[PDB]
Amino acid sequence: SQKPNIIYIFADDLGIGDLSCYGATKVSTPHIDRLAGQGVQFTNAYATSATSTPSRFGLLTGMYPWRQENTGIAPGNSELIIDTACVTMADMLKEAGYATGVVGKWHLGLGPKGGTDFNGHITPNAQSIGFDYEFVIPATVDRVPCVFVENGHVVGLDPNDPITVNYEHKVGDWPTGEENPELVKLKPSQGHNNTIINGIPRIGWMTGGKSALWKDEDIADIITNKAKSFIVSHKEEPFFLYMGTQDVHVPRVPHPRFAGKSGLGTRGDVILQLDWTIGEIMNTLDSLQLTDNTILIFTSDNGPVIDDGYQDQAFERLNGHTPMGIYRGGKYSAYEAGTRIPFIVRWPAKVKPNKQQALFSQIDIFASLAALLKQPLPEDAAPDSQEHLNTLLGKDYTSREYIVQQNLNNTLAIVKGQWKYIEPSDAPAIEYWTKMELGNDRHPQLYDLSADPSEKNNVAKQHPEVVRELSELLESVKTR
Ligand SMILES: CC(=O)N[C@@H]1[C@@H](O)[C@@H](O)[C@@H](COS(=O)(=O)O)O[C@H]1O
Ligand SMILES: [Ca+2]
Q1: CA-proximal residue: ligand 1, atom 3 (nearest)
Q2: Does domain 403-479 have CATH number 3.40.50.620?
Q3: In sequence order, what E strands does 43-160 have?
Q4: For residue 139, which ligand has an atom nearest its CA?
Q5: Would you say the CB of residue 308 lies under 6 angstroms from ligand 1?
Q6: In the list 2, 65, 345, 381, which could disulfide-bond 377, CB 3.0-4.6 Å?
């Protein structure tokens, strides 16, 4: 064929150390390892951000999320965060002649100023920014409402039982973690004490849509089947599938057939469920003879977290597993494990198996696919996205000049050749809930990653001219 199919899969909070192809010894990921073996495994690939909403925003817009105020972790009832006049990756692939679909985790908002009204046609939605087809989890599985949205309508919604959602105060009289601990089956470790759904207290309050409520143990199966439907439906045409798994995000509710199979508790169990999901996508492609001329990109939105809010024994069951690999920090953090993510590109027709050590950022995927397809961008489109197609395909080992990282508190860090600079911040050093090291410091930090990849040795006092140059460089990206 001329024009490859494109599948982009965000895992949720999957760590640079969670996969056996990245050296995990305490858990085995044979489907994802097989994918690695068939394509290009990246060892220096980064998301824009150490959290969900901003990394997904940066990927789809080709604009750094920290250039817009509303791009932080979004509530389940956030208005759509991407302006409908923005050119998205989905829009440019639609212009390039692809059928476009989003399946799974969205977390970019739905509906207009005021927040999501879940009770009729929800607009603007993913279809307002270049997706033909939409089947989404509004935000995260730990956030209300716990329902799916398909082409702008809640699946199984009864108009006589309308939904209301509120993140400021209780609406309705549904049990909560706070008031009704007797009805809590998975106890919260950190907040998560609002409306209970299926015995799991969630973030935010909801009432109504009883018949629309999902079953947590079926979410991977539902996402996997809707992804396969989309692929089977577009067997004969060029398609783009943007897919977001729930795994390995809290609450971790493995299907019974994975539950207790890892021996790392539910956190390990959903790594195996995730590996099985990617296996199902690879088997579907193979079935339809679409393997060879499909670009399959598998990555994560941000780094990993052990205890992210439920008493699921993820620390107690960890068994010497290292989700962060050697790296400092994790989810939320400006330290490397915040934005360092697993990243695999398989395109058998065109791309030989390889390890890509080059510096790569998810911000460049938009301009890199546009360049591949020779698709022209409006002057204002994908403004921070550089063409690095050769690097993406393992055809060159040319690093990005620098990459930019954003933590929870919008502290930015820049990596240039061997050097990592973290700009000063007044935000807390330690994240209140998880106690994660955020890398917020009133003083500059400088790490030589070639010598000190675990960021053990701040050498800012040793290299003021390096701090000054990288500081001036980061400020010029900000004011560009
Ligand atoms: C105490 C608490 O509420 N913690 C939650 C965490 O559980 C998770 O839901 C996170 C977003 O994760 S992300 O991957 O979608 O950014 O938001 C935090 O606020
Ligand atoms: Ca995430």
Answers
A1: 191
A2: no
A3: 45-46, 99-105, 133-137, 149-150, 153-154
A4: 1
A5: yes
A6: 381
Rounded distance between C-alpha atoms, residue 239 and residue 242, angstroms = 10
In testing the pocket of ligand 1, which one of 266, 308, 311, 434 has its CB within 8 Å of the most ligand atoms?
308
Structure tokens at 389: 């197609």
Q: Is 152 in the pocket of ligand 1 (CB under 6 A)?
A: no
Q: Measured from the CA of 142, which atom of ligand 1 is nearest?
A: 9
Q: Are strands 5-11 and 153-154 parallel, antiparallel or unpaired?
A: unpaired
- The amino acid sitting at 422 is I
Resolution in A: 2.0
Q: Tell me: cis bond preceding 256? Omega within 30 of 0 counts.
A: no
Q: Which two tokens stand for residue 377?
A: 């961008």
- Sequence letter at residue 439: G
275 lines ligand 1 (CB under 6 A): no
Q: How far is the CA of 201 from the centre of ligand 1 (A)?
A: 13
Identify the nearest ligand to the CA of 306 by its number: 1
Determine which helix (DSSP H) or strand (DSSP E) holds 391, and give its type and residue range.
Answer: helix 389-392
Of the listed ligands, the closest to the CA of 140 is 1
Which residues 6+ apart lie within 8 Å of 453 measured at CB?
326, 327, 336
Q: Evaluate whether the domain defined by 5-163+208-392 bears CATH number 3.20.20.70.
A: no
Amino acid at the residue 402: Y
What's the CA gap between 411 and 334, in Å, rounded? 7
Kindly give, in sequence order, each residue whose CB lies less than 8 Å from that of residue 189, ignoring residues fewer than 6 positions away.
Answer: 307, 309, 310, 311
At 248, which amino acid appears? V
The Cα 246–Cα 111 span in angstroms is: 22
Among protein residues, the one with the nearest Cα to ligand 1's atom 9 is 142
Domain ranges of the chain: 5-163+208-392, 403-479
DSSP secondary structure code for residue 395 in this structure: S
